[PDB]
Coordinates of C-alpha atoms in Angstrom, one line a residue:
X1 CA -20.2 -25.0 28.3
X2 CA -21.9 -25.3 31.7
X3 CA -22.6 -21.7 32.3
X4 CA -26.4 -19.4 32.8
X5 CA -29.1 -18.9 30.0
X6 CA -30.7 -15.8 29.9
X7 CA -34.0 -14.9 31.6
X8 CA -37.3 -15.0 30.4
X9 CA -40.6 -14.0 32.1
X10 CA -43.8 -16.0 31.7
X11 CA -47.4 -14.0 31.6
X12 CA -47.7 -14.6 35.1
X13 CA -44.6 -13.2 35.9
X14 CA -42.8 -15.8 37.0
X15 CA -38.9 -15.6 35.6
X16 CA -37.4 -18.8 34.2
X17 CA -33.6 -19.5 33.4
X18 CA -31.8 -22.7 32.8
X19 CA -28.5 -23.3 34.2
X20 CA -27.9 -26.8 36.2
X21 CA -31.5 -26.9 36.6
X22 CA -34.7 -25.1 34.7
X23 CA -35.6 -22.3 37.6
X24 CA -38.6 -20.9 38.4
X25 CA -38.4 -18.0 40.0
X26 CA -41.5 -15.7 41.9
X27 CA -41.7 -12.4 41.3
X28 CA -40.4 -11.6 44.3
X29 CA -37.3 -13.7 44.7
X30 CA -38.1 -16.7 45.8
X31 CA -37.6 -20.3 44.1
X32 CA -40.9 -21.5 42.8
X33 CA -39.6 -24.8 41.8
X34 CA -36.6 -26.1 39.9
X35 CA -36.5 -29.1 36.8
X36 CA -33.9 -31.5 36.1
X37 CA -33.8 -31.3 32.3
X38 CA -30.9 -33.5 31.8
X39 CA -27.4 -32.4 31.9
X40 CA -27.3 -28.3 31.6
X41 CA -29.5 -26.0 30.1
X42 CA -28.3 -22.6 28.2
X43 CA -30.9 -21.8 26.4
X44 CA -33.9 -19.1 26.8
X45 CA -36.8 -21.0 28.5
X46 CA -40.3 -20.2 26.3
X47 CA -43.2 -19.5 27.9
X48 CA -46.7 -20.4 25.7
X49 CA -50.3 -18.8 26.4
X50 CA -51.4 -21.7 28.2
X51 CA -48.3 -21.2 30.5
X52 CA -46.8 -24.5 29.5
X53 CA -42.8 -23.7 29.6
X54 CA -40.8 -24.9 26.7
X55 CA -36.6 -25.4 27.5
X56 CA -34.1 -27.0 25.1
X57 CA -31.3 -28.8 26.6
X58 CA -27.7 -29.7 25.7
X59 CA -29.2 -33.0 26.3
X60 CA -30.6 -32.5 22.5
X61 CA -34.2 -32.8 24.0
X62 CA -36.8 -29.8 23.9
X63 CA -39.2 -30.4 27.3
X64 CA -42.8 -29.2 28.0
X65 CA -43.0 -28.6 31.4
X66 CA -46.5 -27.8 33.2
X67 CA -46.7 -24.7 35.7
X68 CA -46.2 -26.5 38.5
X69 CA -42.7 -27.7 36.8
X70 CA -43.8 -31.3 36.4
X71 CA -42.8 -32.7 33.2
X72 CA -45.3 -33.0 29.8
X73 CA -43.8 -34.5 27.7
X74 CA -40.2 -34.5 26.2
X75 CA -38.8 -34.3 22.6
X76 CA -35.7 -36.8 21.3
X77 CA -32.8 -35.4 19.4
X78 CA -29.4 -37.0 18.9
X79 CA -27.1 -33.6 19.6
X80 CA -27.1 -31.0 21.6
X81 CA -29.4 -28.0 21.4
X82 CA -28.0 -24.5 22.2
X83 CA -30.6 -23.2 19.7
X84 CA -33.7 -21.3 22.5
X85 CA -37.1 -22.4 21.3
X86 CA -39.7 -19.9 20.2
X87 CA -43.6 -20.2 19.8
X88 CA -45.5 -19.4 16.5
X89 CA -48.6 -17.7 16.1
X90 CA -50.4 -21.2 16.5
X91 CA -48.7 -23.0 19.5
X92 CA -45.8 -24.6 17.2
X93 CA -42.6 -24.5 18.8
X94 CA -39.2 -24.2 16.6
X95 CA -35.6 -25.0 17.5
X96 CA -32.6 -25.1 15.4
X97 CA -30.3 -28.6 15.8
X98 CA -26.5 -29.4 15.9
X99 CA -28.0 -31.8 13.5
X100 CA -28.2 -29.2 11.1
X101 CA -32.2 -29.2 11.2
X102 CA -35.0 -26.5 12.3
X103 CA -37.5 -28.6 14.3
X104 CA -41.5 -27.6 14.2
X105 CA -42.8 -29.5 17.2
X106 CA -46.6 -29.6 18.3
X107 CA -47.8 -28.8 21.1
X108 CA -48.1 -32.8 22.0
X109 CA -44.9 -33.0 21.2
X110 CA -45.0 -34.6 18.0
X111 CA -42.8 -33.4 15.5
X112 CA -44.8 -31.5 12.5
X113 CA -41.3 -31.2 10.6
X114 CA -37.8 -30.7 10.1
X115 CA -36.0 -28.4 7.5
X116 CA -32.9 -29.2 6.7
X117 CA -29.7 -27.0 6.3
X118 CA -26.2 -28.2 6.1
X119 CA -24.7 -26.1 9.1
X120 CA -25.4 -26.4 13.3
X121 CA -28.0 -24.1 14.3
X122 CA -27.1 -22.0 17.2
X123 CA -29.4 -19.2 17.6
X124 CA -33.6 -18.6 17.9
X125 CA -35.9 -18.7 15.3
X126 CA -38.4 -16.0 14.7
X127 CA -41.7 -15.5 13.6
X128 CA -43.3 -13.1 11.3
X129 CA -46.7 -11.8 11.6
X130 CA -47.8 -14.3 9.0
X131 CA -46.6 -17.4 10.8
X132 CA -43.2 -17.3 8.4
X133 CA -40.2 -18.7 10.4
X134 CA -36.7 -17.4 10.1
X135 CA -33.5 -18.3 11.4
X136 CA -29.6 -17.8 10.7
X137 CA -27.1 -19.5 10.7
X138 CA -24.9 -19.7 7.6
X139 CA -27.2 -17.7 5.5
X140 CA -30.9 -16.1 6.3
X141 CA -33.6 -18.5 5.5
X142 CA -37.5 -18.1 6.0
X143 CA -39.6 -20.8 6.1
X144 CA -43.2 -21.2 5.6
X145 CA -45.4 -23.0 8.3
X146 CA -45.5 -25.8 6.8
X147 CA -41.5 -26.4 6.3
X148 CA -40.9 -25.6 2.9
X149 CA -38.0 -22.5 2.6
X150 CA -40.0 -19.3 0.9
X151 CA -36.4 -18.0 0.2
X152 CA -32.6 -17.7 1.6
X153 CA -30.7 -14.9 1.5
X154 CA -27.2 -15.1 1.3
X155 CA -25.0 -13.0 3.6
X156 CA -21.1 -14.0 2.7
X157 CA -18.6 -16.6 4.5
X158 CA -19.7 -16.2 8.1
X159 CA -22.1 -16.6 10.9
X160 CA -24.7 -14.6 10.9
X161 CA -27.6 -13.8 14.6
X162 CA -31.2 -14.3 15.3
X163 CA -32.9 -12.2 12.7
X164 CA -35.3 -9.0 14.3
X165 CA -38.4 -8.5 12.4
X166 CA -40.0 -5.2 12.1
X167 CA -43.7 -4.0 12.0
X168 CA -43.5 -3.8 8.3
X169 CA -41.6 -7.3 7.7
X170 CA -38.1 -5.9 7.4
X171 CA -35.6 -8.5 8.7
X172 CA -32.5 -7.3 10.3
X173 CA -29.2 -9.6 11.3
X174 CA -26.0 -9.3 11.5
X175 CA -22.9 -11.0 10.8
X176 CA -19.8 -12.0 12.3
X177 CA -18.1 -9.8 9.9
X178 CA -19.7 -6.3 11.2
X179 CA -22.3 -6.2 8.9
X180 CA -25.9 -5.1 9.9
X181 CA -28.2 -6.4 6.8
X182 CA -32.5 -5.0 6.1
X183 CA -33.7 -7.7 3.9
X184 CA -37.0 -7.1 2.5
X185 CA -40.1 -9.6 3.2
X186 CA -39.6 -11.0 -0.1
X187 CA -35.8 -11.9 0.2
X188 CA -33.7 -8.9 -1.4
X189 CA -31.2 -6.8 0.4
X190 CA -32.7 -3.4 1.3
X191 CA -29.5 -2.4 2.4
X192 CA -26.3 -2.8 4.9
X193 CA -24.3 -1.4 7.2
X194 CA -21.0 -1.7 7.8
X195 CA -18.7 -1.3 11.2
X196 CA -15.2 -3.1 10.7
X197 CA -16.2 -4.8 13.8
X198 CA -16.7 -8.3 15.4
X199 CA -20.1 -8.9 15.7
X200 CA -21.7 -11.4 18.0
X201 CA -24.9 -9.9 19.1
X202 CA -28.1 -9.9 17.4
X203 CA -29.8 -6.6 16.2
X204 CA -32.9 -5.3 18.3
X205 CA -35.3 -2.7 17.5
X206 CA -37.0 0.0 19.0
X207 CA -37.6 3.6 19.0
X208 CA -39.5 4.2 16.2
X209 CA -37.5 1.1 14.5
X210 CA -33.8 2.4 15.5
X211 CA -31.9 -0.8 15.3
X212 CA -29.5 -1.8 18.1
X213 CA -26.7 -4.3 18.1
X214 CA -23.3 -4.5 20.1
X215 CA -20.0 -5.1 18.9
X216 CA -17.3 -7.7 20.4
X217 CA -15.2 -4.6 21.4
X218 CA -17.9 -2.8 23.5
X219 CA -19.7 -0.1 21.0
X220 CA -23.6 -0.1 21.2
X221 CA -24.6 0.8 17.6
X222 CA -28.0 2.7 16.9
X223 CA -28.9 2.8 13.4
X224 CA -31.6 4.2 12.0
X225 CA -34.2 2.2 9.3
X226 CA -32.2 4.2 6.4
X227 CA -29.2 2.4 7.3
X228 CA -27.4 5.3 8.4
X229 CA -25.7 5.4 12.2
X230 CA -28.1 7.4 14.5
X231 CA -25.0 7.0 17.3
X232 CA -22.3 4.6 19.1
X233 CA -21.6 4.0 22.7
X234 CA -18.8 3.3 23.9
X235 CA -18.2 0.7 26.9
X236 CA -14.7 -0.8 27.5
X237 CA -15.8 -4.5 28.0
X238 CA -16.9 -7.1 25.5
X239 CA -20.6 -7.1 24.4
X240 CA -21.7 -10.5 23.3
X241 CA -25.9 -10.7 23.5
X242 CA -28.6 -8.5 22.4
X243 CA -29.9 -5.7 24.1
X244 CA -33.3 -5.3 25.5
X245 CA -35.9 -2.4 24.6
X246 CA -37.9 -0.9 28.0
X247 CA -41.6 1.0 27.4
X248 CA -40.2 4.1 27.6
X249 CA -37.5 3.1 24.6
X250 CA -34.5 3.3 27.2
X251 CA -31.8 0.2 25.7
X252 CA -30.6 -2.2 28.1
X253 CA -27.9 -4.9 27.6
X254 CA -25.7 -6.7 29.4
X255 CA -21.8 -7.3 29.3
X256 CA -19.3 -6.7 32.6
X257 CA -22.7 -5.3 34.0
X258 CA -26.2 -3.7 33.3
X259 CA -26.6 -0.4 31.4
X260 CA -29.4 1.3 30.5
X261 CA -28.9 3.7 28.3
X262 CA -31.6 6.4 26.8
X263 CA -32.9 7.1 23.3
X264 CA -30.7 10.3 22.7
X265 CA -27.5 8.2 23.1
X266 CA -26.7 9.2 26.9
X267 CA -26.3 6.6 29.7
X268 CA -29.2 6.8 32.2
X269 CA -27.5 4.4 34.8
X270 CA -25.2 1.5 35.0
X271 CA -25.7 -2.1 37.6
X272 CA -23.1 -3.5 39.0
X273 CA -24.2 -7.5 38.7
X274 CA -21.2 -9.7 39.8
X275 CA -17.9 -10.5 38.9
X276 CA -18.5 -12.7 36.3
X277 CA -20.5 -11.1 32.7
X278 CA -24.3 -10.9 32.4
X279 CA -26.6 -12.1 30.2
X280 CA -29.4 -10.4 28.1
X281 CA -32.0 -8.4 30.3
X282 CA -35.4 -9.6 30.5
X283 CA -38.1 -6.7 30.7
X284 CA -41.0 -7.0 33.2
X285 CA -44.7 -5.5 32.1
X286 CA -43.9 -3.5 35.7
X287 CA -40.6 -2.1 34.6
X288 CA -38.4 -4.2 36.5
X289 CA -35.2 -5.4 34.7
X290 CA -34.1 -9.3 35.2
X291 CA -30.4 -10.3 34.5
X292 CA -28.8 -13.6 34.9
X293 CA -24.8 -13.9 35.8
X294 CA -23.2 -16.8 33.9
X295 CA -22.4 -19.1 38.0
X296 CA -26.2 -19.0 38.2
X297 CA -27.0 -15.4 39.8
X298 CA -30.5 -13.8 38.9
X299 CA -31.0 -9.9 39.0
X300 CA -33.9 -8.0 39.7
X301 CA -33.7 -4.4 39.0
X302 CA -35.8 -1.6 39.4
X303 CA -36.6 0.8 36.7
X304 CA -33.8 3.7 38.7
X305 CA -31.1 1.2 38.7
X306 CA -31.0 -0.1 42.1
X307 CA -31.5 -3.5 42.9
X308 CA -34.8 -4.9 43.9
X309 CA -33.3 -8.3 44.9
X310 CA -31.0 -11.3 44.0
X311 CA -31.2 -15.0 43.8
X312 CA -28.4 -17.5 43.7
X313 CA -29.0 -21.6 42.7

């Protein structure tokens, strides 16, 4: 389980991962500072307004951590946490527990609530425009700010991904199954999708809400908001995370490496990152695309595909 988390990028710029260690990384390749945070990180590090740096950690605590990577203030659990925290419209931060709980944590650290489910919670919340939380695991719930479920919608036997939410409230996941479900804001199907395929990734969205998701076997799916396929890309290697949506709508994602591939369907380059797979790409305000490797490699890339630089922990 000791492996990379995916990158994140704070306002600033600085680019955070958790691995050993929580990294902070400059924009221009060099180490900022590093965080013990117990032992191994592989979630998403969050990054609030105030710059304060939110990591979960399979030590089951969620740490604040200050810019200058001095510790806040941390937050107990009794399990593990492979659930990455997200920030709400108001500063609360959410994490989903091996305990079976969602957490809503304030931004001293005290706990606001916990909603309970009876089922590990693996993946990110997220947060709708009017401060509802959602999160899947073994069914969609949505939760209102102050912890009570709004509804649940129930997607069949098996694990279903971090939900997307559209402009319009749509939520999008998918499950294990190869389904890609649009629930409505108030809880009923709009419709779904089906692929015969293992699903692992989350759905993304972008251009012109095109929904995005890859399956186990290597296809990048682009659906359109009807529910019908817009087109499928075909890789020969595993795709496991979500992809990443750039300004210009070209897709990113990683899997044996980087690809980038544009709106109409047609690769516009591919990154060679490593031996080992790569973990969701992180988009920079300037263009530049960040990758980690699962043995602790960070990728900077520039918008053409060639490398801008690499760190190693």
């Amino acid at each position: 389980d000791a492996i990379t988390s995916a990158a994140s990028i704070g306002k600033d710029g600085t680019i955070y991962f958790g691995s050993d260690k929580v990294y902070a990384i400059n924009p221009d390749g060099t180490e900022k500072w590093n965080f013990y945070a117990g032992y191994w990180t592989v979630t998403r590090p969050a990054i609030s307004e105030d710059g304060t740096i939110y990591v979960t950690s399979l030590d089951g605590h969620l740490y604040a951590i200050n810019p200058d990577g001095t510790e806040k203030w941390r937050f107990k659990t009794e399990k593990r946490i492979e659930s990455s925290p997200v920030i709400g419209n108001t500063d609360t931060i959410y994490f989903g527990s091996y305990d079976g709980h969602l957490y809503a944590i304030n931004p001293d650290g005290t706990e606001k609530w916990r909603f309970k489910t009876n089922d590990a919670i693996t993946s990110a919340a997220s947060i709708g425009k009017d401060g509802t939380i959602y999160f899947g695991s073994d069914k969609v719930y949505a939760i209102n700010p102050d912890g009570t479920e709004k509804w649940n919608f129930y997607a069949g036997y098996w694990t279903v991904t971090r939900p997307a939410i559209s402009e319009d409230g749509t939520i999008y996941v998918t499950s294990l199954d190869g389904h890609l479900y649009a629930i409505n804001p108030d809880g009923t199907e709009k419709w779904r999708f089906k692929t015969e395929k293992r699903i692992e990734s989350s759905p993304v969205i972008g251009n012109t809400d095109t929904i995005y998701f890859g399956s186990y076997d290597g296809h990048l799916y682009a659906i359109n908001p009807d529910g019908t396929e817009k087109w499928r890309f075909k890789t020969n290697d595993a795709i496991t995370s979500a992809a990443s949506i750039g300004k210009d709508g070209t897709i990113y994602f990683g899997s044996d490496k980087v690809y980038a591939i544009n709106p109409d369907g047609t690769e516009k380059w591919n990154f060679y990152a490593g031996y080992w797979t790569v973990t969701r790409p992180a988009i920079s305000e300037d263009g530049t695309i960040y990758v980690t490797s699962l043995d602790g490699h960070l990728y900077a890339i520039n918008p053409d595909g060639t490398e801008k630089w690499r760190f190693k922990t």
